[PDB]
Structure formats: C-alpha cells, structure tokens
Design a protein around this ligand. Structure first.
Ligand code: A1EIK
Lengths: 1335, 462
C-alpha cells in the first residue's frame, strides 16, 4: 500500500459513527503511523508544505479530539504525537471545517424552523426519556400540542405542516406519527408564581440549574401575552421541568415574547432575574456558570431578533416590538456582561461587550484599560496587552508591568519586576512563582531549587505549589533522587512539568505499569484544551503547545519502551521530528529538554555527546528566536560535540549579538583548534561542519571591511571544494562575485562577461543541490544572462570591437545555462516562469534559443500552468511576442506530441474567453446567458474530446518547493502543485455582469470535481502586472507561513489568480463572500439613515488648487460628521457569534496590516474603497486593482499622500484601542519579515520592475504597442528608481526633503510613522473624494 | 572582567558540576545582589543554609547586605547575630546602620572606628605612591561612605547639630563609574531610611534615579532598569526622562521618544505653566531630549525640531545645552538649506554664532564644539564677503550687512563672555590674524586683546 490510500480509508473510519469503529480505526492509525513513520516524515518534510493527506489527517484528528469518548479523544492525540507536531505553517488547513450556523434570528413560535427545532428537541427527549416514563409522556403531550399549535401534517396540502413534516428526519417522523394523533394528559401542577422570590436565581429552587431555569421559564410563560407563544410554552412546561435542555432552547423565545407584551413592571422583574444571574459570582455549583451562559444566549438571541426586526422596520406594531427589545437590551449594563463573561471564562464575549460599552456608550478607555489588559492576558493575545500598555497615558503599576512582561516574555525584566513586587508585598505566592519561573527559563536550574527550598523554609504552605519548578529543574538536571523526594511531597500537583517528572521517574525505576498509566493520564489532560480549541478556526496553532506536548509524550513513550523489558528500540527520527516543528523556542525547547532527559535515562555511550547536540540545537533555536542569554546557558551545557559545532554556534550567537569581529575571532580559533590546517578532515560530519565554518568565516570577512576581497573569494572557493554538493558556498560565492563584479569591472558589462559566467555557473550549481535560494539565485542568474545577451546584441549592432569578445563570452554563458537546463529540475525554472515568459522577446537569437529550451522543458513538464502563464504572450498585440510564443509552443510540441491537442484546445478556450470578455454589453442587463450569447464556448468545453484545462487557481499556479531538510536530493521527482487538480469541465448557464464602468462579466467555471469556481474577466486592463504581483504575494505568504510570529498571528496576504487572456483582458479568480468597504459602509449608513448624496459630495469638493487648511476644514466639518464610524456594526452583524467575531476582527486587523505594509513596500496606490474588499466569513481583507504600483499614484493629478489606507472607519473596526494593538504589532511583524527576507523579495521584484512585457507605460506612445519594429519589450524608465525606493522602504529608510541627512528607522518607528501618516487628517483631506477618505 | 549580567549562568553550571563547591554559591548570590534582586538573595542563601547549614555562615554577609538595602532592620539583626565571624564590608555597614536604628551610640562609634581602620589597611599597603589613589579609590569611596554615615547618624543620636554634607556635590566629585557611585548611593538610601523626614520618601527615588544614571552611563542597563523601578514610588518627571535616556542607550530611539512624550504630556500638561523652577528645569531637559531624538529620527521635519529646540531655550534661557543644540541644528541644516552657498548662509550664521555664544555665557561644557565652530563660521563668512565684495558679485552688499550683524553679535559675545572662554581657541584666533576683512580683524583684535590682558604671559608665547 502507498500509505495514502490506507490513510484515506483509516480517516474515513476515524470519522465513522459507531464509537467502537472509531476506536479500532484510531488504534490501527497508531500502529500505522509508527510503522510508516519514515514515509510520513518524507511527506511532512520533503516539501515545505505537509502533503495534503497530512493536512486532511490532522484536521480529521483534532475534530476527533472533540470526540465525546475519552478513549477516542486519547487515540486522537496519540496519533497526533505519532505524527509529530508539524509546523502549522506546513499545514494547509485550506478548509479546516465548515461549522453549521442558524441562518436567522428565528422570528418566534410561528417560524417553521423554530418549529422543527422544537420537534427535534421533543423527539430527542422522547427517545431519552423512554427510560423514565413520566418525562417521556410529558414529551409526548408537548409534541402533540406542538403538532396542534401549528399544523405539522400536510394532509396533502402545501401548508406549513407539509414542509415541516418533510423538514423532520425520518426517525423523528416515525417517532412522531404514532403519538402524532393520540391525545395525552398534562401533569397540571400549576403554580401561582407569587410565592417564589422574583430573583429566583440563588433561591433554593434556584440553586438547581435545571430548577432555576425551569422556574424562570414558567414565570415567563405566564408573562407571555402572545397566544401561540403561551401554547408552545405550556406544552413544553413539563418538559422544561424535566429536561433542562429543552428549557435552554426555548428560554430566549420566552424572553423575546414576554418583552413584547410585558409591562414596565414585568420587564423590570425579568431584568432583576437577569441582572442577578450576572451580578452574582460565587457564594456571594455549576449553576452560576451555566445560568450565565443561558442568559448570555437569551440576550444574544434578543439582539439578533432586534436586528432582524430593524431590517423589517426599514423594510407600525413591529416598530414598537423592536423598540421594546432594544429598550431591554439597553437596560442591562454592558460592563456587567463583560465582568460576567470574564468570570465565566468566556473572554471573547467579554471583549465584545467591553468594546460595545466603550463605543456604544461613550466612555474613556483609560479608566478601563486595566480590565482590557487582564482580558487580553487571559485570551493570551499579547498584542492586546501591548496595545493597552501603549494606549495608556498613566504610569503602569507594578502589577501591570508584570502583566506586560509575562506577555512579552522578557525573562530579565520579569525577574526584576517580580523581585520588586516581593519587596512591595512579600506575602504573594504569585510573585515567587514568577521569580522561579524566570530563574528556570533562563536555565538557572540549581538556583531555582535553592530559591524554592528557601521559600519553603520561610513558608512551608507556599512550597506545594512551587514544587513544580523544583521537580522541573531536577528532572532537567537528571537528579532523579531529588525528583523522587519532591514528587512524594506533592499529592495533587497536576502541572505538566510534574507529570513529566513522574513519567521520567517511573522510567528510571522501570515501573512499567505506573509509567503507562501516568502516560494515559498526562496525555488526556493535554487533549482537553485541544478538544476545547478544536471547535474554533485555526485551532492547530492555538493548541500547538498541547500538540507539541503530545509529540513530546510520543517521543517519551518510544524512548522508554526499550528501557523496559524490550524492535522496541526507538525508531523515531528525532532530528526530523524536530525540524518538522515550528521554528520557535516555545515549541522546540521543551522538546529538546525532554530529548536530553530521555537520553540521560538511556545513558547509551554516545548519549553523552547527543546531549551536547541537543543543547546546541536549543542554542540555535534561542538564537534564531532572540533569547541570547538562554542560547548562552546552552552553549555552556554543551561541550561534547565540540568539533566546531560549538564554535560555529557560538560564532553565530555573537554575530546575532552584532559582535562580528569577536565571532570571526572565536570561529578561527575553532577552525585552528579543530579541523587544523595541518591535517584535513575527511570525516563526513567533520567535513560538513568544516564547510559550515569556512562559509561563516567567509561571510564574516565579507561583513568586515578590513578583509581583502581575494581572501573572501578564496574562502568561498574553499567551501565549494570541500562541500561541493552543498547549495551554500556555491551560492554565496556567486552572490559575492555579483557584488564584486561591478567594482572589479567599473560597471562595464564588457569586463563582466567572464565574471557573469562564473556567477551564473555557481548560482545554477547551487540550484542543483538545494532550493533554499530558488528565489534569490535563479532570478539573478537569468537576469545576468539575458542582460549580457542584450548588451551583446547592442554592441554587435553598434559594431564595437569588444562585441566579438562579448559574443565569445555569451557563447560560454549560454553553454553554462544549457548545462543548468539539463541538470536543474523543471520546477526550479517554473518558479521563475513569468520572468522567462517575459524575455520571450529577447533580441539575441542564441539567447532566445536557450531560453526556448528552458521554457519548453518547463512546458513539457507542467503544461497547464505554463500555458496559463504564457497564453497572453501568444495573444498579445505585438507580433514579436506572438511569434516567439508560437515558436516555443511548436518546440514543445515537437518534444511531445501529446502537448499539441491540449495546446490547440487551450488556445481555442482562451480565444473564446477573451471574446466573452471583450463582449459588447446589450446595455441594461444585470446578466448575460452562456447558452444564448456564449454558446460556442460552452460547446468547446462540453465536448468530450476537449483536453483537460485547469481552473487556474492560485494554489495550482504557485509551486511548492522542496525543503532544504529534504535530503537535498528529493528534487528529481518532486511534485510542485500537489493536491487536487480541477479541470474546466463546464461553464455555468449564467454570466453575471458587474455594475462597474468597465462592465466586467463574471463567469463560473465548472470543475471536474463538480464544484463551481468563479472567475471574473476584467474589461480592458493590464492584469500582467497584477499577475506577477500575486506571485510576489504568494512568496510573501510563504515567508509568513514559515515565520513563527507571523503564523501565530495567522498573517497572510490574501492571494488569488490574475491570469491575462490578453494584454487587455485577464481572468481573475473570485474570492467568495467578499464585499467592498464602500458598498458595505454605504449599506450601513443607509440603514443608519445618514447618507451623503452625490450633490452634497460635489458641494463639499474644493478646487484642486486650494488651501490645505480649507480642504481640512471642509473634510472635518461636513464629510467626517456625516460619515461617522460604523464598521464595528458590520463586524457585529456578520459575525454574531462572539468567538467568531473576535477571530474575524483580529484577522481584519492582521490582514489589512500585512497588505498595508506589503503595499507601502510595493508603492501600492489607488486603494479606494471598492478596491479594498473584506471577507464576510473570516474578516480578512483582499486587495484588488493593482494597476497603480510603485508610487504611480503620486503621479496622479490628485497625488497620493497616504502610504496605505487607514480611515477612521477602518480603525473603528480594529476596536477602541484602534491602530495600537493587534494591527500595529502585525505591521511590525510583517515589516520585520520583509526586512529579513529583503534579499529574495528584492531579487524577485527586480524581475518585476524590469519586466518588458508588462505595460509599464500606459500611454500609447503613438500606438507603440502596434508600432514596435522588432521589439515586444517596453522598458521601465523608472525601474532603478522604484527598486531603490523599495530597497529603502525595506531597509527602514525614508526620503525626507526637510534638509535632513537621514537615518534608518526601526521597524516599530517605521510602522508608527506609516500609521501616523496614513491616519493624519491633513493628508486624508488632500485625497480625491474617490478614495472616500471620509469613509 | 564582568562580561554582563549573565555570569550567574556560569556559576550555576559550575554548581551543577561541583555542588559541594561553595565559591560558586558565593558568586550566584553576588550576581543576584548586584542586579537588584535583593529579596531573591535572601531566599537563595536560606535555601543553601537548609541544604548545608555550614555554608550559611560565609553566605550570611549577602543575606545582610540585602536586608539593610531593603531596610529590613529586624532581619539584619538575626542575620548578624547568627554569625559574628564575618567581617565583610557589607556586614560591618549593616552593623553600623543597625546600631544607629536601635540607637547605640557607643557601639556605633566603636564599630565605626573599627571598619574605618579595616578599610585604611588596604590603603596602607597601596599607599606606596604608584598611582595609589586610583588603586585604592574603592577603599577611599568607602571612607567617603563612612563619613556620610557618621554625619547622617549623629543627629539621630543627638536628639542640635545636623548633617552639613552636600550629598549631591560629594557625588559628582567622585569617579563617574558605577563601581564607585553606587555603593555611595545604596548607603545613602539606607541612611535616608534610618532617618525618616517627609521628603525622605522622595529623595530615595532621586538616589535610585542617580544610580540608574551611573549604570546607564556605565553600560549595564538591567540594574539601571531595576533602579528605575525602585524609583517609581516617588512621583517624578525625571523618571520618564531617565527611562527614555535608558532606552536611547539600548538604541531604541523611537520607544524612548514615545515614552518621553508620554511623560511630558502627563507631567507637563499644556494647560498649566511649568514654572516651578525645578519643574521648569525638568521640562526643559525633557523638551531638549525630545528635540534630540527627533534629530535622530528621520521622520520628523526640520522645522519642528528647530521649534522644539527654541521652546527649550525659551523655557531655560540661562541653560547652555538648549542654545548649544539649537545652534548645532541650525548648523546642520544651513548647508542643506542654503545649497552650500555662503552668501545665503549669512543669517543662519548669525543665529548660530549667537546661540553658541549664549551657550558659553552660561556654561563651558561644550566650549570645544562651540567656540571653535562659531569663530570658524564668522571668519569664513568674513573671507567670503571680502571675496564677493572684491569680485563685485551681486549679493555682496547684502553679505556686507549680514557680516556687520555677525560682527556685532561677536562683539556682544566678546563683552559678555569671559576671556578664558576665548583662551581655548586662542591658537585658532592667533591663526585668523591675517584675515582680509578689516572689520572682522577689528573684532578679532578686541577678542584676542581682551585675552592678552587677562593672560598675557600665556598669550605672548602663542
Ligand atoms: C476580490 C475581487 C473579486 O474577486 C476577484 C478579484 N476581485 C476584483 C474585484 C474588483 C472590483 O470589484 C473592484 C471595484 C468594484 C467593482 C469593480 C471590480 O471595481 C477588481 C478591480 N480590479 N481587479 C483586479 C485586477 C487585477 N486583479 N484584480 C478586481 N478584482
């Protein structure tokens, strides 16, 4: 078996219905993972993204960890450990889940859907209470009374009873029909309801959750004025007394209804009950928590119904009903709801209610910043703690600083603040907790044990909770006797570290039973937060910590089982199980500590050395994370694998600290001490390390100004000669020659010839051994080559004598590129296909021949994607581009005849698509039909002979590169574009016409899978620029997925496909459920009733030449006020669920941050309201219309002074804190990523800025595009300038004309400047009213 | 050679390797002690004592040093009675502070004589004069400490006489190093605690801020941060200023500017005037630091920076730093503003020499940056105006009038400023002697002549 079919079957079984089948499937998927671990590690690691099956699996796994049964909940996690804690960035989670949601605020007892819900509940109670006859008879009476109140039986009619009987399931129907017609008697234990204390909650009958709930429901049913409501409440009254759940379900409706017919006194009574549930906390039972949830739900339904009733209002008595519900919803204090949700540990809902209390009721955030900070700490959203610390004017109190640091993770400052707190209030256990935790994370283990024993001497009672840290240190020190003594002390400590110490000890004493039992235990207490988190979106990343704990438990179980009686050797590939994980300290460090402890238990001979390698890995991790002091605490703990693996890591640590010289010094000391010049190291490991070290020495040299260039080139060449199969060395040498060649050749291509040859050669040799730099090496390689060919053509045209030497050098370079073509893999060229599709019009014939071999190789390998990328060059207006692409395609055909029918079919399809596209609209028609007007296209597609053409989605057009960890040889059969390929099977029958001036015709392409993909065709426009931009954005989405901060924030530049079927048309992929900012805000303003007509807007317009102060006066006096902030209302309306609301709001902040900074870097403009788009499902933003790129906007008649769009509405959505908080720190994070990945980004962009095909110069130039004698290339005159500006924006430099020299800005300061500049009214006012800066 | 705070990690590794070794346990508490972490020290040594009751006797000194710094006088008593064998400086200082708290005149003065002799002994061996004073500064700052002590304790005993020691000046007189100033400052905090005057809750924050300053200026920033924390309880704007300066040292100019702007709007709200003299001085220092940050940050416009510096000068006109940095910025802008054309630089040169001179009237901290640059600008503009007048250029007459204004400013300085302020840079003035412009030569003559009178013997040689 290929293990993919096995996994498919096994997963289907996992999600089976019968619990026993689920369990046996899980168990088989726990011996299967272990026996096929090597294959699974190949999947999750061979490519940067975990193969699709692995994503489907972990997703089927977590949802399994929600399984009710504990044994299946356990087998789920176990399989999550046997599988590894894969980096959530490797995991796709494209469609993690689609949770069902009630698509209404069900109007009342009249609604058929609420009817069906009640009938489902009553039948569930009937089946549940067949065990208890009284309750079941109550249910039968209730259900017949429901059949009565509203007809449930069609009687052959199309009446409500008809669609309702059809609405019930068949089992509910077979339960209903028997009792559907039989009368049953009610208990009729009627109650006056006077004797009961109106604040029933906390009364005797109150203390019982179901009892309080039932009593309140009865009092309400009595208050109900509506007749059908009274009937439905009376029939379920007994059931409510029997089943708390039927009550919970019906209570919101009882509320909605009584509120409608209640008098002021009745409303006040219900309000007293409700406000008593929330005001009570504990003893001043699950009752408080459950009833708090119940009242929260009642109020949420009441608000949903208020909103629906207001929709009907804008669309009388209903006005008064809406007024009643709004009144009551106002009566209750938002602050109380917030404190309650907090107490109820529902932090998201509390955040929502607090944000409303701040905005819905004008309040000063500063007085309540502390509560918000506690919430964000509990939510574990550190960006929130920071946004509060920033929005706060006052000086942070000690406790507030403690919180800020606990969120920051600064160990040093936290330690100091905790000691200060202890000085301030000595009788606090939490401060000592923080102190020992700081002494622990820093690695001061024995210091921790001594601090603990001391505080035990002072306070014995204080120890049992501090013991966890003593035992953690001990099992980290391997002081197993101390671990035993400390564990014997704590009888109830359940913390992770204590349980791990118990497991490690049981393993030390070889107590098999104890070990496996405490393992089934320490494994369940982790799966619990996962079951709780699995419900949300992006759960894997939320519950990663616990998934990492499961990976640790697996590594344990498998390293110990040989320690026992003992095949039972640990078969896990620890190095791979670690590489797969997330490139963060928080994840890899505990894993490494447990790894070294497992070793210390096995005490194998090498394990003395393996401990050193684990310490070095921990050091490298903390270094790549910035915890330099812990990296040092590790560099000390090491010393066994000191064959320069230490000296190398110490040198890197210093380099990160910035002390390049000390780093070079210590590294040369190592290279001399070990790997001495006198004896060469031929040992594979010694050789790899010697190469790493020589390369680091070369890099340091390069960074140091003193060293002469020749020594640096010599060092890099030594690397290549030592580790020639290595990507690095080759790559860095070529990169240096590229920096050195301009200086050595005084920026003259002629002398650059041979240097270019060497550079290209080594860039390609690198691409042959590894794809770590496929984005920095291939573009520069192809650019140097194509450009030298261009200069050679230029000088052979000019007739210069040097032209012949250039011809010879170009021959050499072409031979090099040909050898690369043969060696390198097709996808390595594919990742740069757009660049190659660009040079398709190169002037030099030989260069084009080689480029043609390249492009045709890529095509013969990945024809669909290529054609989709080069369909334009074939249809373009320039004859040269067309002839070049036709030549390439004919070459490919001759290589492979099969890529002939596909070619012709795709060409026909594209022709018809651009015909559809350049279609003269009939005029006033919201729709055109495919069968009427575009019939020939439907015919081409529907024909069976018609080749299979992909729906050109982004996931299918953007490759996936193999991982440097992937044995560096995977890239011979590697498969980019892994996953399901969906072909163009059919075109829907309807072709929508959009309301734009361009009149773009939306279509829907039927996929072979049967799913429907939507693809817009833009009228005349240049989508090529947008295409390569989406490529850059996919590269950015990569860099963000790998980075840990970004992915923890879930940053992502929303990306879709932009395919040009021509120079005029393209076919953009449609992201579903997206509405623009202007349409959204206009709809909301209309609902609010305040709106600005075009005439008012024209009056508010000032002359283009006007006083800035006057424009500002007008934009503040009339525009802004008429257009208040409402966006938060959009968030509240589209995402009623509090959790979903917070998720989508955070994603809005974090996605517009990404795309704002991404845009500022890209000089993005024309960010008007209709170009920004927001997803109704996830709240993410998705930009469009990337025609204005690289500060082309500042050239517009109305210059763009705003780097990106942060309007007061856009801020009001981020929350009360506004920019400060999630959005700001996300901007900082993404700018940091862009700055660290400055080089790949710049390398790919320079291929975008210099792209000849793209219409950089929009004007015709006297129909230049037709009137080019022999050229299809339009040069970008502002190329170098855009490149320089972008390199600045990335470096942190900003050009300032106020007579200042300049200095680079820190990412935080750059972000602050950007935000200030983009939200500054003085700049917004200057913007044309098209940007709708007021909105 | 203290690498950084993180020498504790090495001591702890050693402990993990040789736990019976004590020198390491000594080093650990000692590092925790230097990095504040006072209360943490007391628990460390008590834990050790529990593990090994023998080591506590030699570790008792660190449990006493922390206690009298925390002012926990009862704890000091137990940790001292436990072991009398320890004669470590910290232990003796604790004994004295206790004898003062529990007023014991005879015991205090006796132990004072004793410790004071103990500290003199290292000097007796180091008294042999080969740069001795600097070899023994550590023991001489300890005598300084004992004298501050004797003078603060004496009133607590008498009841009368009181301390006349100028605690501020006595500190600047010392070597600007943390190893020297801090022991003085911790002792000063402890003395302020022994006495309890209504201000002596605030002055403690002042001493903590001075400790932060000496640490910052001395590099190590984490102990400075701890001191800042221990300074918060006292209400101060100096706290925000120093926190910014501390961030600036870490390189985070932006976060520093942000904090400092928060502290200014909070401590110096625009509505009410800051003219409390002390409050005014702090507001001026803060606005200056703001204008200096803004100078580093590229985002900020030059006009706003100039305005901030001007506001600093207006809040503190008698202050040097304000005028100096304002003129420095004028000088940094003038080439860019004027396109490196002197004739356009005339008026900017006027403002620049003006503010330079005012700076010198009030202080000579920057005299080596100011007087030379001022004289250079003046003499150079004079050369240029003589040239353009000699060439007949168009702007020459305007150049003549601007040179007149500048010669007048230089004359006003010549009159206000002290001749010694010109003395440094006399070699420069003796250089431009052959200046071509006659009026410039007259101003230079009055300048160097005013010097000749004050210091002829040293001038006639130059
Ligand atoms: C995410 C959405 C829907 O999904 C497809 C991508 N997309 C849109 C949507 C729009 C507009 O809605 C914006 C406004 C309102 C009506 C009209 C069209 O002008 C454009 C404009 N340019 N582009 C381009 C060009 C290259 N890439 N994208 C658009 N792409």
């Amino acid at each position: 078996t290929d293990l993919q079919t096995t996994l498919q079957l096994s997963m289907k079984a996992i999600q089976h219905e019968n619990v026993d089948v689920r369990i046996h499937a899980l168990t088989s998927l726990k011996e299967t993972l272990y026996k096929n671990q090597e294959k699974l590690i190949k999947y999750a690691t061979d490519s940067e993204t975990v193969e699709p099956i692995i994503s489907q699996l972990v997703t089927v796994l977590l949802k399994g960890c929600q399984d009710a049964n504990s044994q299946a909940r356990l087998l789920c996690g176990e399989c999550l450990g046997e599988l590894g804690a894969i980096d959530p960035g490797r995991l796709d989670f494209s469609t993690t889940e689609t949770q069902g949601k009630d698509f209404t605020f069900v109007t009342g007892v009249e609604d058929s859907s609420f009817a069906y819900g009640l009938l489902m509940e009553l039948t569930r109670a009937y089946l549940a209470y067949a065990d208890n006859s009284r309750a079941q008879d109550s249910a039968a009476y209730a259900i017949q009374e429901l059949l009565s109140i509203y007809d449930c039986r069609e009687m052959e009619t199309n009446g409500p009873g008809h669609q309702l009987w059809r609405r019930f399931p068949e089992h509910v129907r077979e339960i209903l029909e028997p009792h559907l017609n039989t009368r049953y008697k009610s208990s009729q234990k009627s109650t006056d309801w006077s004797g009961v204390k109106k604040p029933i909650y906390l009364s005797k009958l109150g203390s019982n959750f179901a009892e309080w709930s039932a009593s309140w429901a009865g009092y309400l049913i009595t208050k109900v004025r509506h007749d059908l409501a009274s009937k439905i409440f009376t029939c379920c009254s007994i059931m409510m007394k029997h089943d708390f759940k039927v009550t919970i379900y019906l209570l919101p409706h009882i509320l909605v209804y009584v509120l409608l017919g209640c008098n002021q006194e009745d409303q006040q009574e219900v309000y007293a009950e409700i406000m008593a549930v929330l005001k009570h906390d504990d003893q001043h039972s699950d009752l408080c928590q459950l009833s708090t949830q119940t009242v929260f739900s009642m109020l949420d339904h009441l608000t949903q119904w208020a909103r629906h009733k207001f929709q009907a209002l804008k669309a009388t008595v209903d006005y008064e009903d809406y007024q009643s519900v709004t009144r009551f919803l106002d009566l209750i204090p938002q602050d109380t709801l917030a404190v309650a949700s907090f107490r109820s540990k529902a932090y998201t809902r509390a955040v929502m209610h607090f944000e409303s209390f701040i905005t819905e009721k004008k309040q000063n955030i500063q007085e309540h910043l502390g509560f918000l900070q506690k919430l964000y700490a509990a939510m574990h959203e550190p960006d929130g703690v920071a946004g509060v610390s920033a929005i706060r004017k006052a000086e942070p109190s000690l406790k507030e600083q403690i919180l800020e640091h606990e969120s920051l993770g600064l160990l040093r400052d936290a330690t100091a603040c905790y000691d200060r707190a202890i000085q301030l209030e000595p009788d606090q256990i939490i401060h000592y907790h923080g102190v020992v935790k700081s002494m622990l994370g820093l690695g001061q283990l024995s210091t921790v044990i001594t601090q603990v024993n001391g505080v035990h001497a002072n306070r014995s009672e204080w120890t049992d909770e501090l013991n966890t840290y003593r035992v953690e240190a001990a099992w980290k020190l391997s002081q197993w006797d101390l671990v035993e003594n400390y564990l014997a002390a704590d009888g109830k400590s359940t913390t992770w570290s204590v349980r791990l110490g118990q497991l490690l000890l049981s393993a030390k004493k070889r107590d098999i039973t104890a070990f496996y039992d405490s393992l089934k235990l320490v494994r369940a207490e982790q799966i619990v937060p996962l079951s709780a988190a699995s419900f949300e979106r992006g759960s894997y990343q939320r519950g990663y910590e616990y998934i990492v704990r499961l990976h640790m438990l697996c590594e344990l179980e498998h390293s110990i089982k040989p320690l026992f009686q003992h095949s039972q050797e640990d078969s896990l590939n620890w190095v791979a199980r670690l590489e797969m994980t997330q490139n963060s300290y928080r994840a890899k460090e505990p894993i490494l500590a447990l790894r070294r402890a497992l070793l210390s238990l096995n005490k194998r001979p090498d394990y003395n050395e393996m401990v050193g390698e684990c310490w070095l890995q921990s050091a490298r991790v903390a270094r790549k994370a910035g915890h330099h002091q812990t990296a040092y605490n590790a560099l000390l703990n090491a010393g066994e694998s000191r064959l320069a693996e230490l000296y190398v890591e110490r040198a890197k640590w210093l380099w990160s600290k910035g002390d390049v010289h000390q780093a070079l010094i210590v590294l040369q000391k190592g290279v001399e001490l070990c790997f001495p010049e006198n004896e060469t190291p031929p040992e594979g490991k010694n050789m790899l390390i010697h190469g790493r070290a020589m390369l680091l020495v070369g890099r340091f040299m390069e960074e140091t100004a003193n060293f002469e260039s020749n020594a640096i080139m010599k060092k890099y060449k030594d690397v290549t000669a030592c580790l020639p199969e290595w990507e690095d060395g080759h790559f860095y040498l070529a990169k240096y020659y590229d920096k050195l060649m301009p200086m050595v050749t005084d920026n003259k291509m002629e002398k650059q010839g041979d240097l270019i040859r060497y550079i290209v050669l080594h860039f390609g040799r690198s691409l042959q051994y590894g794809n770590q730099f496929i984005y920095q090496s291939m573009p520069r390689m192809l650019t140097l080559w194509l450009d030298y060919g261009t200069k050679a053509y230029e000088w052979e045209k000019a007739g210069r004598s040097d032209r012949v030497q250039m011809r010879n050098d170009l021959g050499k370079i072409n031979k090099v590129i040909t050898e690369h073509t043969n060696y390198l893999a097709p996808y390595q060229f594919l990742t740069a296909f757009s660049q190659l599709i660009s040079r398709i019009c190169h002037s030099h014939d030989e260069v084009f021949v080689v480029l043609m071999e390249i492009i045709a190789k890529v095509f013969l390998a990945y024809p669909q994607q290529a054609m989709w990328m080069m369909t334009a060059v074939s249809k373009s207006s320039y004859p040269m581009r067309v002839n070049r692409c036709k030549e390439i395609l004919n070459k490919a055909i001759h290589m492979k005849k099969s890529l002939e029918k596909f070619v012709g079919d795709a060409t026909r399809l594209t022709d018809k698509l651009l015909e559809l596209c350049n279609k003269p609209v009939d005029g006033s028609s919201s729709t055109l039909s495919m069968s009427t007007h575009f019939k020939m296209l439907k015919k081409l597609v529907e024909e069976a002979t018609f080749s299979e053409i992909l729906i050109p989605l982004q996931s299918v057009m953007i490759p996936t590169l193999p991982s440097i960890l992937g044995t560096h040889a995977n890239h011979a059969s590697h498969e980019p574009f892994p996953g399901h390929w969906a072909y163009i099977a059919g075109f829907d029958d309807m072709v929508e016409i959009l309301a734009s001036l361009q009149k773009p015709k939306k279509i829907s392409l039927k996929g072979s899978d049967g799913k429907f993909y939507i693809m817009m065709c833009k009228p005349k426009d240049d989508l090529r620029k947008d295409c390569r931009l989406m490529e850059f954005n996919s590269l950015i989405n990569k860099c963000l997925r790998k980075d840990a901060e970004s992915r923890r924030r879930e940053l992502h530049i929303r990306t879709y496909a932009v395919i040009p079927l021509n120079d005029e048309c393209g076919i953009i992929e449609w992201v579903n459920n997206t509405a623009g900012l202007r349409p959204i805000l206009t709809k909301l303003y209309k609902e609010k009733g305040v709106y600005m007509t075009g005439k008012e807007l024209r009056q508010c317009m000032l002359p283009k030449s006007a006083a800035l102060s006057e424009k500002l006066k007008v934009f503040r006096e009339f525009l802004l006020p008429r257009h208040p902030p409402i966006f938060h209302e959009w968030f509240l309306r589209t995402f009623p669920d509090p959790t979903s609301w917070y998720s989508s709001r955070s994603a809005y902040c974090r996605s517009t941050a990404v795309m704002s900074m991404v845009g500022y870097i890209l000089g993005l403009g024309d960010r008007h309201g209709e170009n920004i788009l927001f997803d109704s499902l996830t709240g993410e933003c998705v930009h469009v219309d990337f025609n204005c790129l690289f500060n082309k906007g500042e050239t517009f008649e109305v210059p763009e002074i705003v780097p990106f769009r942060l309007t007061h509405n856009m801020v009001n959505g981020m929350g009360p804190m506004g920019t400060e908080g999630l959005f700001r720190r996300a901007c900082e994070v993404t700018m940091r990523l862009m700055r660290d990945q400055r080089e790949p980004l710049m390398s790919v962009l320079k291929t975008f800025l210099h792209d000849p095909l793209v219409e950089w110069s929009k004007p015709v130039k006297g129909h230049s595009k037709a009137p080019l004698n022999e050229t299809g290339e339009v040069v970008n005159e502002k190329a170098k300038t855009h490149v320089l500006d972008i390199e600045q924006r990335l470096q942190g430099v900003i050009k300032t004309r106020n007579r200042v020299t300049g200095l680079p800005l820190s990412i935080e300061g750059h972000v602050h400047y950007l935000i200030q500049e983009a939200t500054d009214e003085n700049l917004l006012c200057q913007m044309y009213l098209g940007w709708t800066p007021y909105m």
